[PDB]
Amino acid sequence: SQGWKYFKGNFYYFSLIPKTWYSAEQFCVSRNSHLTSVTSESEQELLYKTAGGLIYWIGLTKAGMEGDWSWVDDTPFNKVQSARFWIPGEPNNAGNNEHCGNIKAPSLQAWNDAPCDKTFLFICKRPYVPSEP
Amino acid sequence: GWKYFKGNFYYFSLIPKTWYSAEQFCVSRNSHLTSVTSESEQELLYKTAGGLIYWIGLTKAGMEGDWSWVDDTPFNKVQSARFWIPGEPNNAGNNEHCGNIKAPSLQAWNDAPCDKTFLFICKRPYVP
Amino acid sequence: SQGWKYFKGNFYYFSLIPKTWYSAEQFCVSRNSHLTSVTSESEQELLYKTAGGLIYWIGLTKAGMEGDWSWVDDTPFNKVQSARFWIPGEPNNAGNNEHCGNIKAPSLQAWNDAPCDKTFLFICKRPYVP
Amino acid sequence: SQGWKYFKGNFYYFSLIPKTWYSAEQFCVSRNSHLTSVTSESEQELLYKTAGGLIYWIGLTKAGMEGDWSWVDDTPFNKVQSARFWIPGEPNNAGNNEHCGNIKAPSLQAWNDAPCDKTFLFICKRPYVP
Amino acid sequence: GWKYFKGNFYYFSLIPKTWYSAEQFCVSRNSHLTSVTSESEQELLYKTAGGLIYWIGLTKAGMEGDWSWVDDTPFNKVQSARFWIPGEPNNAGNNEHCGNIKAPSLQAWNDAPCDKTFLFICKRPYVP
Amino acid sequence: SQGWKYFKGNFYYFSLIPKTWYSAEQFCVSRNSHLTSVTSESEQELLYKTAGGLIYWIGLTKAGMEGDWSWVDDTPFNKVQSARFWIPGEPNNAGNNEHCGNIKAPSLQAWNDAPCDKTFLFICKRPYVP
Amino acid sequence: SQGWKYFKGNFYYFSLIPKTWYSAEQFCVSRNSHLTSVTSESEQELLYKTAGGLIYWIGLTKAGMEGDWSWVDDTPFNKVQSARFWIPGEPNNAGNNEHCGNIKAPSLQAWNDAPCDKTFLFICKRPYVP
Amino acid sequence: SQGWKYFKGNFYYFSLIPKTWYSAEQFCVSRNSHLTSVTSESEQELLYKTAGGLIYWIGLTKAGMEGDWSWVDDTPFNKVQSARFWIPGEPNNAGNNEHCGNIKAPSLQAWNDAPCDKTFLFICKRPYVPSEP
Ligand SMILES: [Ca+2]
Ligand SMILES: [Ca+2]
Ligand SMILES: [Ca+2]
Ligand SMILES: [Ca+2]
Ligand SMILES: [Ca+2]
Ligand SMILES: [Ca+2]
Ligand SMILES: [Ca+2]
Ligand SMILES: [Ca+2]
Ligand SMILES: [Cl-]
Ligand SMILES: [Cl-]
Ligand SMILES: [Mg+2]
Ligand SMILES: [Mg+2]
Ligand SMILES: [Mg+2]
Ligand SMILES: [Mg+2]
Ligand SMILES: [Mg+2]
Ligand SMILES: [Mg+2]
Ligand SMILES: [Mg+2]
Ligand SMILES: [Mg+2]
């Protein structure tokens, strides 16, 4: 597929069709990828600038017993270093039912919690694995 | 309301949810949507289900869309072929990427769209 | 890789060279496999009969903070259903240092815990792919 | 334990007793941690300066049938961005037997591959989780 | 080599081509991949085909992926349901958007990927 | 729209108001239909029996440079198989001006050509949608 | 015919005899042409200047169950880019019976909808095909 | 679907996956569209500038008895006014088997004939039909 943008050792797909969070993950896995994690300011900047005004699912979901946030790609979640990327006042767990996260605002403070069963465009991340000629 | 069988507890829900919302329900209860790895466990499940459809932990994984178990039990294509309803998985509409227990038989499983809501079964390990 | 034996949807490799548990694991992963799990009586039977009274690393290892036993292939470990597959009195954690497990006796009570850095022959399991 | 050191959302344990790579990773998992991953220059610099010229196992290990490097804490391994962190000429798979990695040189270019069965001090990592 | 039947001529090719390359072959011969609109024409085709698979003018059209005829004969869902192999069209792999004559029966049609190569049948009208 | 009669996968509307051929066509298209084609004997039978000995525009019209007859619904026109459905001696092109066709006689030899701008009742055909 | 006029890859016939919209379109099809479409300002200007203040049927006709305008030569009708070409206030469907369109006013805003059964001179178009 | 760009009363989809010419058409029809026609310089400019260096099928195909070029959307083909949009020396009917057309060069002279059964990205065109509020 076209549509995979390179950045710092990964490729990033910004979908054209909207899915629920899990259906989006399943499309990523079928493409040897996962909904993206975000572990730096420069990655966050890529995603929000590319996103423009459109809302995209990323790999953020609740998991374990205390519903701590987690990344579907299994990156260990760093709550300290992730606090800077939430919209102010998010996560707000609107109606006690917002257990997945998307990029919503055009700022490094971009993430919002939303219900997993809601449909949005999504971002996949696929590793690049070079090899010496 | 958990039912005990062979080292696990099983929760047959009362409320329907999508496949992933059921899976997060189970993870909040220290469990996962159930795997099925023996004819006796298939039989416990379809006898308990009383003819109603329940999501189980079957979902697709990889580019080739091989089936997998959300609890990470390796999925055995050969030993489980017998556990599908004849004709399934049929991938209806190109959008059936999760599995449920449907027919009261060893040949019980169907593929269904993951965003459909059904009752669901969690499996929690008993650790004495 | 040759010398794989087929049973119920998996192939099994019985090594002829001893490794530590982890290095055994590494060898299996280089052959697209894992040290084997054991999840039914017929599989245990295959494995101890095949082993021929010789000792092999299997995929048993402690994990998490309670040191509960686990499978390195990520099969959920069923403690109740596996209790019958340990040699009586195992796992005894000799020296407080036996954090891996092997097939040691030719019996359905076959398994012993042993130190991970001891070297034994090992059993890999690989899924049959159609 | 008293001696966990804090940086950027994670705590680090520098061991005082040497272990094989897997026995080190079991000790980290018994402390609710894993052998450490390295995902930025600032983290590599903390680790090699703290190591103070002593060799420590880190979470580098081969995985998959290709033998690509990975992190035992399941952080996706970024081969492009990690190339800066190996000592020049490593991983060199000396002896065809170097399947685990440690912090060896006091430099941003610090890592070596070594036999998993060698004993070295080791470094565990765990995120702060309120 | 054209076979005459009920006001049309029919060409059973000797060379296999994709569905659209066969259709352009037929258009270069003042014809189209055949429509089928009666049991007698179905029967002429599957008896002449001698058990071999031929593309015919069946292809999908609209957002709902209704079948259509390339020669613009309106496609009658009710009168043609009988002309499919039982189970078809099954849309195998999500990529079967053209039709061929496959089984020697009134129940003859299969859906297949349009980029597969088969022999093909053109229909040219006879205008006295 | 009501008053549609079902036969073999289509519905048929027999108007009660006369139009020119084209305006009849327009009316059918506003009801998601076309002036009807006729492609089997049973359909012709339905249509002339229903018409009850009254004259109706059908979808027959000349098109292309030879003035061959055609169907406005784009069914390919089968000249050989339709010859039996014209009244003997039709189409006679009276006045060199009869470029549309109607069902006129209650017989399988039913059709006549007539001028397009004459007004008659008309028959629309609409596919049954499941 | 001698009198076809050429512009931008197409020839145009301005009739001398008036016909209903459909009988005009049949006359164009007997000349290997269609009532004309209009797809640019320069084509509209050629047509209204040539028309010289006389009304001509063009290929505008309703099609589909919604009654959207279309071109009889099957040029996809661009409703956005055609809005400039209607006389202000048209199509006004006078009488609920105006299903065809003609060039009426000598202006870029030229088109009116009129009853298809009205007789007017008409304009045929055909591409040059070497 | 996102990915539909507006221009002069139509929307234009530049695909992310490559198909044969007909399979591309079939995807367009499933989306209530067709492979695009090109009837002006300004439309041609849109397509080649958007395309960049990537090759896309357009609606150009041979049809009728003399294999004249035609548009799949049924726009009548104007050979005079289309001559300016072919790459120099195209169409060349390489190996007597090039019966479909794509946009290839980054110029108003952009079209090339190629075999219909070859796979390329493709462009669909969908009409916009406004209605007064
Ligand atoms: Ca929220
Ligand atoms: Ca199914
Ligand atoms: Ca022991
Ligand atoms: Ca080395
Ligand atoms: Ca099929
Ligand atoms: Ca007559
Ligand atoms: Ca008017
Ligand atoms: Ca060429
Ligand atoms: Cl950062
Ligand atoms: Cl232009
Ligand atoms: Mg997409
Ligand atoms: Mg419940
Ligand atoms: Mg060996
Ligand atoms: Mg220590
Ligand atoms: Mg041939
Ligand atoms: Mg009426
Ligand atoms: Mg005249
Ligand atoms: Mg696409």
From Swiss-Prot, chains C, D, F, G:
Involvement in disorder: Birbeck granule deficiency: A condition characterized by the absence of Birbeck granules in epidermal Langerhans cells. Despite the lack of Birbeck granules, Langerhans cells are present in normal numbers and have normal morphologic characteristics and antigen-presenting capacity.
All copies of domain C-type lectin, residue ranges: 7-125
Biological source species: Homo sapiens
Cystines in this chain: C28-C124, C100-C116
GO BP of this protein: defense response to virus; immune response
Name of the protein: C-type lectin domain family 4 member K
Domain notes: The C-type lectin domain mediates dual recognition of both sulfated and mannosylated glycans.
Full protein: residues contained: 196 to 325 of 328
Consequence of substituting N92A: Loss of binding to 6'-sulfo-LacNAc and invertase
